[PDB]
Amino acid sequence: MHHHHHHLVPRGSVHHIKRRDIVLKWELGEGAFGKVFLAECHNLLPEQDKMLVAVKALKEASESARQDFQREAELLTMLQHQHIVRFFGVCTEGRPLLMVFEYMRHGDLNRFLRSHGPVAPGPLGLGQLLAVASQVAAGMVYLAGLHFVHRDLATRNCLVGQGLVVKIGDFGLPIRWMPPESILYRKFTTESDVWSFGVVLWEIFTYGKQPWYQLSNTEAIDCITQGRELERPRACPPEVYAIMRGCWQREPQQRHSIKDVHARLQALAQAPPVYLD
Ligand SMILES: CC(C)n1cc(C(=O)c2cncc(NC(=O)Cc3ccc(Cl)cc3)c2)c2c(N)ncnc21
């Protein structure tokens, strides 16, 4: 499960939160082992009595999943960046086991894009789409620097918070986002993450449409293995499509580096290009 992160050896122990300091409110979602709740957390930060957090409750007992829980918590404790979901610690007193994250009020980025298509409501402008893209790229520059391979970068795995701050997480194969070497050989690297970033850029510029939406799962696997490229979105300026194409080079060693992709997006976000579909 976390075997691919073995080279990452944690420095310190995970933060422990007392069960009575977590007050569950309501479910935010489920899927992967298992439910996610909005909660209030007491005594976490010294200046604030209580604050909102998202709490993931582990389903299994198990005791193989308990070892996977401790390993995951030690790895998440290492991830400290403005654009990576903030992990606050665990609650291991009794059952279920809990993981606690900073709450991101606007929820997942895929749903956010779909709801703000063609917080201030309405369609997101070019400047805003570039700001979202730049933030996800910043998080990916941080992960590459740590030699952390994400393996499932997609807008459904990003969160939106107050002031449109975007952070990367992993909420639980994502074939449509994968390059040919990941589909065929299960090779997951910094370079397959940059390819998925190019697909995330395509999702952002299509307001959250599924990649290869015109194709079945089988047809999409075949089209990616054959080397067909995703079409340029209508809302995408030429400068941004060039970034996507750089991420999608068939040869992994020819793909643009995430540092350069992020620097290009920063430049465009601080501009933006004069483009109208
Ligand atoms: C969309 C809804 C349901 N939602 C999920 C929230 C979570 O934060 C969350 C839920 N379950 C598991 C995790 N675990 C990770 O993200 C692990 C991880 C972190 C970083 C990297 Cl690089 C890789 C892997 C986190 C959340 C939230 N915080 N606020 C609002 N909605 C949330």
Q: List the helix and strand counts (H, then E) for the chain.
A: 8, 7
DSSP 1: -
Nearest protein Cα to ligand 1, atom 32? 107
> 15 and 90 in contact (C-beta within 8 Å)?
yes
Q: How far does the centroid of ligand 1 lie from the alpha carbon of residue 101, in Å?
A: 7
Instruction: Give me the phi and psi of 181, to 5 degrees please.
Output: -70, -30
Residue 212 falls in which region: left (phi positive, over 0), alpha (psi -120 to 50) or beta = left
Matching residue, tokens 């740590």:
146
Structure tokens at 177: 């986002």
d(CA 243, CA 114): 22
Four-point Cα dihedral 148, 149, 151, 156, nearest 10: 40
Experimentally, the structure was elucidated by: X-ray
Nearest protein Cα to ligand 1, atom 10? 171
Active site residues: 152
Count of positions (residues) in the chain: 277
Question: Is the Cβ atom of 151 under 6 angstroms away from ligand 1?
Answer: no
> 253 and 194 in contact (C-beta within 8 Å)?
no
Q: How many CB atoms lie within 10 A of CB 3?
A: 6
| CA 122 to mean position of chain CA atoms | 24
Residue 105 CA: nearest ligand 1 atom is 30
d(CA 133, CA 207): 12
Beta bridge pairs of residue 7? none
Mapped onto helix, strand or coil, the DSSP state of residue 120 is: coil
d(CA 24, CA 39): 4
For the chain, the residues before each gap (C–N > 2.5 Å) are: 118, 172
Domains and CATH numbers, the chain: 1-103 (3.30.200.20), 104-277 (1.10.510.10)
| CA 196 to mean position of chain CA atoms | 11
Instruction: Give me the phi and psi of 249, to 5 degrees please.
Output: -65, 135
Residue closest to 68 by CA, chosen among 90, 49, 42: 90
Neighbour-count burial of 47, counting CB atoms closer than 10 A to its CB (0-12 exposed, 13-18 middle, 19+ buried): exposed
> Cα dist. 220→79, 154, 193 in Å?
33, 16, 18
Mapped onto helix, strand or coil, the DSSP state of residue 206 is: coil
> 151 and 179 in contact (C-beta within 8 Å)?
no
DSSP 11: S
Question: Is the Cβ atom of 79 under 6 angstroms away from ligand 1?
Answer: yes
DSSP 252-266: GGGSPPHHHHHHHHH
Residue 156 CA: nearest ligand 1 atom is 1
Residue closest to 199 by CA, chosen among 165, 245, 238: 245
Residues with Cβ within 8 Å of 16's Cβ and at least 6 positions away in sequence, in order, are 89, 90, 91, 92
Matching residue, tokens 């449509």:
176
d(CA 215, CA 212): 6
Residue 195 falls in which region: left (phi positive, over 0), alpha (psi -120 to 50) or beta = alpha
Q: Is the peptide bond before 34 cis (omega within 30 degrees of 0)?
A: yes
> Cα dist. 33→29, 153, 219 in Å?
11, 19, 30
Task: Let me know the angle formed at the C-alpha of 108 by 103 and 109, rounded to the nearest 5 degrees.
Answer: 125
114: part of which helix (H) or strand (E)?
helix 109-115
Residue closest to 62 by CA, chosen among 1, 16, 10, 9: 1
Distance between first and last Cα of the chain: 44
d(CA 160, CA 227): 32
Mapped onto helix, strand or coil, the DSSP state of residue 165 is: strand
